[PDB]
Design a protein around this ligand. Sequence first.
Ligand SMILES: Cc1cc2nc3c(=O)[nH]c(=O)nc-3n(C[C@H](O)[C@H](O)[C@H](O)COP(=O)(O)OP(=O)(O)OC[C@H]3O[C@@H](n4cnc5c(N)ncnc54)[C@H](O)[C@@H]3O)c2cc1C
Ligand SMILES: CCCCCC[C@@H](O)C(=O)O
Length: 456
Amino acid sequence: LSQDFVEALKAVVGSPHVSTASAVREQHGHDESMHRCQPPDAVVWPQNVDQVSRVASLCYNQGVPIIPFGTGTGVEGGVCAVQGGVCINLTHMDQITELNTEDFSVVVEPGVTRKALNTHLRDSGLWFPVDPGADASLCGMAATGASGTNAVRYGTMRDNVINLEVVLPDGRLLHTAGRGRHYRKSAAGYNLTGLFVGSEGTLGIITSTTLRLHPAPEATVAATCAFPSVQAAVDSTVQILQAAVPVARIEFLDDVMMDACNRHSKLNCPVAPTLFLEFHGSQQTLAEQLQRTEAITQDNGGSHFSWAAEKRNELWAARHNAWYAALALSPGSKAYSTDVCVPISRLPEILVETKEEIKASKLTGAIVGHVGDGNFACILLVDPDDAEEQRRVKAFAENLGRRALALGGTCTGEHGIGLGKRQLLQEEVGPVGVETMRQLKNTLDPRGLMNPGKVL
Ligand SMILES: Cc1cc2nc3c(=O)[nH]c(=O)nc-3n(C[C@H](O)[C@H](O)[C@H](O)COP(=O)(O)OP(=O)(O)OC[C@H]3O[C@@H](n4cnc5c(N)ncnc54)[C@H](O)[C@@H]3O)c2cc1C
Ligand SMILES: CCCCCC[C@@H](O)C(=O)O
């Protein structure tokens, strides 16, 4: 990468906000996944949207790939610079604006995390519910199409993103639903907001997100429930959803995951396939939800609910850190994660089959999941140097993905495609789906410089 080009970057953002140092590039060449670090040729920190536009235009016109970077907590190598280029770290733009409590909306820049937003919001009576375990950039969450434990009740990023400010690959500034707009519904033209949610940095750079806020619940009850078998826990989940209980959180941990979380958090739950549950409402509504939900879990051998401010906080902090609890089981290890999502009635079959398949192989694995959405993750520990093990783990992940596709589901409920699921995506949407996605990619990124090598 030429020093004339580097000087042009520094002319936009300032010398301290451009780095070509190997260590700095290496830190920005990977996410939290196993995917091998592929360092960008430079890291740039734009300080405002004008600078984002001018960095993009400079890179695009010079044929230099652009890799948007939020908090680097992604799962599929989205920030790996497989063709080199310029990594754009967006987190110095960290302001919350346009807080409209009366309209339940707010605008956030890429450096705002969920914890920052919800801290800004306490005593407002509002909160933002979409809660991935890592305290990620909210714009990165929009880019990946994230969900979380609260999504079963309060929706995914796709449900809660009302507008996006996007710097297109050649530097033009798009407000997907119109500058400054925020509303509950619209039929005006084609919905551009939904196209950029889940685009993973391959269609443009999200420089702000307009988010739906929600009223804080009147009252909250959290509990855990231990089951004799994976079958029993997942059958309970399906029956709770079919009974239309509006549970706020319903999370599955298999016995391996529950033990891992016990050892990583000093929870001390019975080591067993377990549901973490949370219920929102008034005292009247809570008692009714609890009664209907306990009746279903009782039918399937669930324990009496172990009840959990600090104790629910400890409970969900342990759940949010399940990934690290799993890694802590074999220290030094990395891991791959699957993310299939199936029609809920097929969830017992596939998740029990996954448990059986884990057992029948030399691989080790833990299961945790947003099962209220029909979604779960298999966490598969890999020795970074054992290439024999890595290709069994890859083979296992591909086979699980294909089983989910055979059941009418999707290969990823929330994490995305990145580098790891591109073949599964081709199978999932077929030739006309792939060509159509590629045609959209091409009109927004003709030169193919917007995070190349990802998704398609
Ligand atoms: C412990 C743990 C728990 C997690 N739990 C969940 C969970 O429950 N649900 C879930 O969905 N995910 C979960 N994640 C994954 C991850 O936190 C989410 O995918 C998150 O949305 C990634 O945001 P990020 O800014 O850290 O992404 P990064 O890794 O920085 O980037 C992810 C992708 O988005 C692109 N990108 C990032 N910012 C922008 C932007 N502003 N504009 C355009 N493209 C951009 C990147 O180019 C890349 O392709 C978890 C991760 C960890 C480590
Ligand atoms: C590389 C990070 C992968 C984290 C997988 C588990 C996450 O989805 C959750 O549900 O806690």
